[PDB]
Amino acid sequence: AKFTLGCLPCLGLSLVPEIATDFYQQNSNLVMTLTAEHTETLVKKLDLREIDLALTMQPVQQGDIMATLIAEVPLVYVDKDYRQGAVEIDSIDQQRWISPGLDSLSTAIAAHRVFPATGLNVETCYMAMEFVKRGVGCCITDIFSARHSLTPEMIHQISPPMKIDLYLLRRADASLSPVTQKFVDFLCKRLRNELREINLELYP
Amino acid sequence: RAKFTLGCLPCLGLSLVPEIATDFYQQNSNLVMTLTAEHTETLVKKLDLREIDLALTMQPVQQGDIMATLIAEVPLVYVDKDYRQGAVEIDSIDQQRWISPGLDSLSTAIAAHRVFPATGLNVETCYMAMEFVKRGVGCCITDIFSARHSLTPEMIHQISPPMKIDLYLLRRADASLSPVTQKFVDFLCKRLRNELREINLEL
Ligand SMILES: O=C(O)Cc1c[nH]c2ccccc12
Ligand SMILES: O=C(O)Cc1c[nH]c2ccccc12
Ligand SMILES: [Mg+2]
Ligand SMILES: [Mg+2]
């Protein structure tokens, strides 16, 4: 059994290594490879057969890549500047906005508000969180990246609540092994379970 | 009216590049900064495609249209939850617990001293590997930046003989940087060098 999973950086910071660790400890006689890459690179690696599976927040219809919507992930407002509870997107100060590069994210936000161009554009979630921590500005990010890098006081639900879709991509012309099928099922169950606990913690 | 885009390796974006860019951004108004962290191959592709202006890597570029400024040498360290002591000889490392970092500049530096056989676990992003190490799953050799960022000092060990990898700032050979972007390059290179001079001392 041998498979390679690529994920977005927000998922590689902690959740995927936790899930992989639990599976790897329960199932030996396998070779697992893991990597974190932005979406465009994940799709390219699936098309070149450099990875078998990708976790993204955007569907694709390229080639024989099939994207399966597996969960909905909260989007949260993040800032060092104190906020009470939930944040309406129209209350955000566009002068402090850090524009996120994740197209899916920027596209989701843009459905609710078009932020003008700013002096700071950050395309990788954990680098944005560092700028938030140093007080340089504010952002909307996925909860996985916020939860990893920030204290709870810096994380705020949106009003109304905002989510982004989480997808599992694999090639359809390609065929999975049983162990890889078992891993995909385990991975999906643990991701859904984590989002359940996250919902509890986000409740204001 | 001044704009630049810098890509860096993940180990550098976890903390050091945001810190340095924060200091510059603030010293320079009327600036648009774009920052991204990507693996070496992607950085060089983006540089070639003109999607980024500058890339920080740990690998020079072969003959082509890329120029490469040698910033400093980066210590490599052994990381292990279970190892309690001091410097580790490469050949004393337990190959059954080895987490391979895939095929990258780091792996090439290790292979010049020891060729690890194939392992059950291959982890090609530094912070993901640090998570497996913190959970006790295996051991690795990594750059000092990713180690310091995710691990407690107890889990970080020097190698014997000491290993290093070179840090480069890459740019297109056929494109002239704007005056503010050159100023940022000088600032970045100096701060990175001095951060590593400080680290090399503490070791
Ligand atoms: O880097 C990623 O995982 C994509 C991404 C997720 N949240 C973000 C916030 C700001 C910029 C990029 C991202
Ligand atoms: O992911 C990166 O910055 C490259 C890299 C630096 N140290 C590492 C350890 C294990 C796997 C990859 C890396
Ligand atoms: Mg975390
Ligand atoms: Mg990354």
Author numbering:
A (entry chain A): 44 to 247
B (entry chain B): 43 to 245
Relevant lines from the article:
AdmX is a pathway-specific LTTR that acts as a transcriptional activator of the expression of the gene cluster responsible for the biosynthesis of the hybrid nonribosomal peptide/polyketide antibiotic andrimid. AdmX recognizes indole-3-acetic acid (IAA), a key auxin phytohormone essential for plant growth and development (30–32), with an affinity that is about 60 times lower than that of its biosynthetic intermediate indole-3-pyruvic acid (IPA). However, it was only IAA, and not IPA, that modulated andrimid production in S. plymuthica A153 (29). AdmX-LBD exhibits the classical fold observed for the LBDs of LTTRs, which consists of two α/β subdomains, RD-I and RD-II, composed of αβα sandwiches with a Rossmann-like topology.
AdmX-LBD crystals were obtained in the presence of IAA and IPA, and the structures were determined to resolutions of 1.81 Å and 2.25 Å in the P21212 and P212121 space groups, respectively. In contrast to other members of the LTTR family, where effectors are generally accommodated in the hinge region between the RD-I and RD-II subdomains, both IAA and IPA, bound to the RD-II subdomain. The indole moiety of IAA and IPA establishes hydrogen bonds with Thr231 and Asp232 through the nitrogen present in the pyrrole ring, but it is also coordinated by diverse hydrophobic interactions with a number of nonpolar and negatively charged amino acids (Pro190, Gly191, Leu192, Leu195, Val212, and Glu213). The acetic and pyruvic acid groups of IAA and IPA, respectively, form hydrogen bonds with Cys100 and Cys215 involving the carboxylate and ketone groups. Although both auxins establish similar interactions with key residues, a stronger hydrogen bond network was determined for IPA, which is indicative of the higher binding affinity determined for this auxin. Instead, a higher number of water bridges and hydrophobic interactions were observed for IAA. First, the analysis of the secondary elements of AdmX-LBD with IAA and IPA revealed the absence in the IPA structure of the small β-strand located in the vicinity of the auxin binding region (residues 189 to 191). In contrast, a short α10-helix (residues 183 to 186) was formed in the structure of AdmX-LBD in complex with IAA. Second, the long β-strand 7 (residues 244 to 262) in AdmX-LBD with IAA bound is broken into two shorter β-strands (residues 244 to 249 and 252 to 262) in the presence of IPA. The total number of interactions (e.g., hydrogen bonds and salt bridges) is much lower in the IAA than in the IPA structure, 14 versus 32, respectively, indicating a more tightly packed dimer in the presence of IPA, which also suggests a reduction in the flexibility of the dimer.
